[PDB]
Design a protein around this ligand. Sequence first.
Ligand code: ADP
Ligand code: ADP
Ligand code: ADP
Lengths: 238, 735
Amino acid sequence: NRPNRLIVDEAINEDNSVVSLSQPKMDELQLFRGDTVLLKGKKRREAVCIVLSDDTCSDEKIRMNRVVRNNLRVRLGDVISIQPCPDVKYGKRIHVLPIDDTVEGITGNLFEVYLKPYFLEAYRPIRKGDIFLVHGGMRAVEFKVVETDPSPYCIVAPDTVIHCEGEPIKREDEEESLNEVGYDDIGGCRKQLAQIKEMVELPLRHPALFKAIGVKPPRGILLYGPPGTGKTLIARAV
Amino acid sequence: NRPNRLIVDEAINEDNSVVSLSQPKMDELQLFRGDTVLLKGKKRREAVCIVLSDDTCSDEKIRMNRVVRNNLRVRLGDVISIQPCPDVKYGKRIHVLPIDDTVEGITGNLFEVYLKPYFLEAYRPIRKGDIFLVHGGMRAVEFKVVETDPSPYCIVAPDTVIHCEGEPIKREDEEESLNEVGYDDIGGCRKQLAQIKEMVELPLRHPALFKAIGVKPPRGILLYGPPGTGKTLIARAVANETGAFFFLINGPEIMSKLAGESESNLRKAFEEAEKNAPAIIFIDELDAIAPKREKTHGEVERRIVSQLLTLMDGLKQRAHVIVMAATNRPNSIDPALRRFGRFDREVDIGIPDATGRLEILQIHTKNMKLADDVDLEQVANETHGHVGADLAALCSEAALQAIRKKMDLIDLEDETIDAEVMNSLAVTMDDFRWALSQSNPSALRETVVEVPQVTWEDIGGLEDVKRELQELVQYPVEHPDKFLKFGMTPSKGVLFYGPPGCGKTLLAKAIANECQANFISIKGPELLTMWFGESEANVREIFDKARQAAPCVLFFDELDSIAKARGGNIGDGGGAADRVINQILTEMDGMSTKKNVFIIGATNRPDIIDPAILRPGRLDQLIYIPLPDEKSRVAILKANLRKSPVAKDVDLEFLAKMTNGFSGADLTEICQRACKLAIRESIESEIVPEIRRDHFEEAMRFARRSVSDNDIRKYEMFAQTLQQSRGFGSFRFPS
Ligand SMILES: Nc1ncnc2c1ncn2[C@@H]1O[C@H](COP(=O)(O)OP(=O)(O)O)[C@@H](O)[C@H]1O
Ligand SMILES: Nc1ncnc2c1ncn2[C@@H]1O[C@H](COP(=O)(O)OP(=O)(O)O)[C@@H](O)[C@H]1O
Ligand SMILES: Nc1ncnc2c1ncn2[C@@H]1O[C@H](COP(=O)(O)OP(=O)(O)O)[C@@H](O)[C@H]1O
């Protein structure tokens, strides 16, 4: 039954694209702690991330971050596959090209003071066609590379060089705007959101499953709380 | 007169097509017990079934199941014929061909894991063209064979073979879709449905009989009960299985559209039903249609109310139609609709008790198979305030939790789903507990109208009052002629007083079970809720709901509890009467004694009750219950110790005789403390399921004595004063 599938769950870390797995998984696929791992998703695309050991989260699940959520076009409550990749990668050059969808009202050089302090002391592999969010300047902007060295063989190291052009590309409808609200954009209410996770994920991700059985799904959910509690944002995110 | 006709009645079994007959029928047509019987119906078709002996159902009737109901095209309240067929039948091959009407979203092989475990160990004859329902895979699907060996000669045996093709046929209009609601699809209410059976079956199945006689059939039936009780489903079932057209308009579909055509839609709804005679009309929501009590707003609202009143006032004989209406409370309906010829007949549906909720459990969970350690009897006991729809929602939600704990680790991401794994989704104990804890009941504060579950064995001792209560309320009901011959009327109510904590509710509850009647509960806090609310209209229908569910008994607890908040013997400048004392007796003064109803008054202090209540004619029977004796406390304690395990060295005669000023509650709290302290030792020793003698001496330490010596003399002097049998206690008449 291809024993490599993993359920998709929201992570708890507030760092960059770092996944969390359980302790038997480390020895199941002969990985070490600090190694580069490759993930395979849908739409025939790959991804790179870093494994992190955890024994408190669960027994059999993964905790995958918001960056590679939209990078791999994988939503919550789906299937995913993972595999090791013990290959030495030494990046040499990168192409920088933001999209004008969110880069508005900002001029000057935003590549030598904004992306520089974020890449050092991270040692995070990058892939051709990644979508990650970074902070700085009272706002946030994503990143996307369209033409670079063929992935794999990309590792953040000081010897790598950078070069900018200054002509943003037009976005397409193939991907989703990460600036929208996600599941990790709601805080302060953990017990209330878990009820929605087990109330809405089934009828939406499995339409034929409920269309084939006699179980009647709920047709209405009432949201309570004082005005401003975040009722609109929960509905927008789910 | 062809002595072979049989009336059609709904069966009680939950098995496949098995009929039930009476004991003389077995020898009338020379049948044995385990034989194949043939039934002949209308439309020139035959049927096969199995006879089952029964002596409890009736004297002359049949109890025929839901499968052959629709298989033989025979509805309830019709004629039928039966005949033996002692012919040896040995089937050899069967053709399987489902209809795509309900087989949707299901793929794979559904003939080797679904029909296989259902046919074995059944030995049920089958016929060419049968329609039967089977369960499995969180859903149900019927079956129909179109071409096979010529019936008869079809018996389920292991030597038979099967073969499938995989091309469903298109259904026709000759038969009826069995997936709809039937009469056996309603549970938890048996006494309420029997009234409809004798109210709707006559004008619908016999149109010419009423058209030829001068009897005026009812033109409107009002349905009561909290929302979700099943009012819509009862109306849907009583119309789909009578060959009568059913038209449904709920409550807001009228007000949703623009003003001007809403009345036209209502008018044409009545006109279209007359053409399809016989027909029926059901209104799901009507309290939102005619709120003519406190609304007094909207020009078109009264126009719609008057249009409905005109449409039903004008319902002459012409054709056959019955108008049904459903609501939540009797006080939320326009009184102009309650006039004669519109809604003269009313029926109330209450929340089912344990024996009703048990049935509503399987009537919904039949489509999913359970485990060998999962039972519905114990889970239906904790729930008391759940509406009939609450239980169905709980089952559906528990199914989701049962499937969620495995669907995560299965991770079967595919477009279609097979039926080989949807059937293996069994539910366990861990899912009902979570579902029942997370559920939110709807009717928790409605009037508690249920059948108790306590008998005379639960109450120890008190043999003096048992005979008095046995000779007072059962004699007028069992022997009505004797009371009428003498010319006097039976008593209407019994009020008793005594020290608190003597089971004043237990004898009132037990008297209802042995007399096979309903029971209502109006406790003290329930009686203090309108002393402040300034709403005297709520005490109005508590008697109506009791008299509608005849026979019934009315119970009043701590009847003087209102006087405590107002004082007592002196209190304020007033006396011993208020806005609620004058409402208790005014309503029961004008009631008919002939009705099978009873009023029970329980109180602790009889010196505070106003003498107006105790007047001869309303509450004249006074019974004083003293402290239990030594020989009665043994039975009282062993009644409570029945559920918990009891060791062999536990002596109860000595334990009961060492209490003198202890009432009934003092013994129950001692047992509760002992059995609670037993759990502490069991948990502490874990880091045994039997109680011992060591848990007693540590439990009687917390023995409380609520009934002090000041109240005993106060009650005795009142009882002796109210009894007064001195001076002429023993006298012989001369002649
Ligand atoms: N629990 C929360 N988590 C994250 N953001 C919140 C939360 N509650 C409020 N907010 C922020 O404040 C605003 C809440 O408004 P919103 O919830 O949409 O209206 P309402 O409170 O009426 O539902 C949003 O802009 C949201 O970003
Ligand atoms: N007594 C009952 N027997 C069987 N099913 C019931 C019963 N009560 C409720 N249900 C189920 O719950 C639902 C309750 O809806 P319904 O009773 O039609 O609305 P209302 O409660 O307003 O009459 C029904 O559709 C039925 O499936
Ligand atoms: N004869 C008896 N048999 C069984 N239980 C009794 C008896 N007398 C008193 N009790 C217990 O006393 C408890 C109090 O019952 P209750 O009806 O509240 O008394 P009261 O009439 O004072 O309200 C009951 O739970 C019952 O088990």
